């Protein structure tokens, strides 16, 4: 699965 702390600027619950 993706690591949300690879780039914290990416919010995976957003278009």
């Amino acid at each position: 699965n993706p690591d949300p702390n690879a780039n914290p600027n990416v919010d995976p619950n957003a278009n």
Partner: antibody, heavy 120, light 114 residues
Framework: VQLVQSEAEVKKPGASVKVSCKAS????????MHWVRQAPGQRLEWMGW????????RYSQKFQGRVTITRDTSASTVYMEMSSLRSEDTAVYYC??????????????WGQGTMVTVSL | DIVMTQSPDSLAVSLGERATINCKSS????????????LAWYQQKPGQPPKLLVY???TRESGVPDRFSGSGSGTDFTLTISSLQAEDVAVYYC?????????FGGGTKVEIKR
């Protein structure tokens, strides 16, 4: 939003460099600032990031030994420090707000690079 | 790490023609739970920093000409310039933000015939 980086530098091998990145146009503490390097004729390489809010950092296993990323919220500025410089570290060094994807907006700002040359 | 491999390494087409750039990731960057591909495309011109074109593999960045489009999923991705314009000469990079360390492709150089 603008990101303005420190002036171009030259350093002797084994020395250290500290590159500035001043932000403007947005609330400084909301996003993380990354450092990316581009060696001549070689691919962009990610170095690390820092959360401009709480100061937390992550580094690539390349640069973990020799790189330190800090920030000053009052000055709205991020810093990158490389120690034990080698001739292979000659490159352009970028700070960037990489892929800020949120429900409200989606944006990506880079600084103008900072050339550092490691040479005798 | 996730290796990003681009093809071709360079392309040349006449003005108004279609240019296609392929990018392949060494691991899938699709997350089944949200159906999102953690991939982005950048444009870089000499002496300047990269500029974001596409994110989530297929969502154009704001302010980017609509002739730019991203496509693909999993490990196979495509950037399309439907009608190449004079200003589009540059090097193009894919980028993954699925896993640490963040990584970039080797770049595709797009040239204009005239």
């Amino acid at each position: 939003v603008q990101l303005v980086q420190s002036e171009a530098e030259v350093k002797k091998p084994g020395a250290s460099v500290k590159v500035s990145c001043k932000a403007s146009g947005y609330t400084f503490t909301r996003y993380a600032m990354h450092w990316v390097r581009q060696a001549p004729g070689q691919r962009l390489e990610w170095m690390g990031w820092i959360k401009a809010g709480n100061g937390d950092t992550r580094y690539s296993q390349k640069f973990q030994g020799r790189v330190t990323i800090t920030r000053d919220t009052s000055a709205s500025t991020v810093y990158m420090e490389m120690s034990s410089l080698r001739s292979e570290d000659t490159a352009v060094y970028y700070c960037a707000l990489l892929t800020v994807i949120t429900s409200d907006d989606a944006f990506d700002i880079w600084g103008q690079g900072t050339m550092v040359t490691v040479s005798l | 790490d996730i290796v990003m491999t681009q093809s071709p390494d360079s392309l040349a087409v006449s003005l108004g023609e279609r240019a296609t750039i392929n990018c392949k990731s060494s691991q899938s960057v699709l997350y089944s739970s949200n159906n999102k591909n953690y991939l982005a495309w950048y444009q870089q011109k000499p002496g300047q920093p990269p500029k974001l074109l596409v994110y989530w593999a297929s969502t154009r960045e704001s302010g980017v000409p609509d002739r730019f489009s991203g496509s693909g999923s999993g490990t196979d991705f495509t950037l399309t310039i439907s009608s190449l314009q004079a200003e589009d000469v540059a090097v193009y990079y894919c980028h993954q933000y699925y896993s640490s360390p963040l990584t970039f492709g080797g770049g595709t150089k797009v040239e204009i015939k005239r």
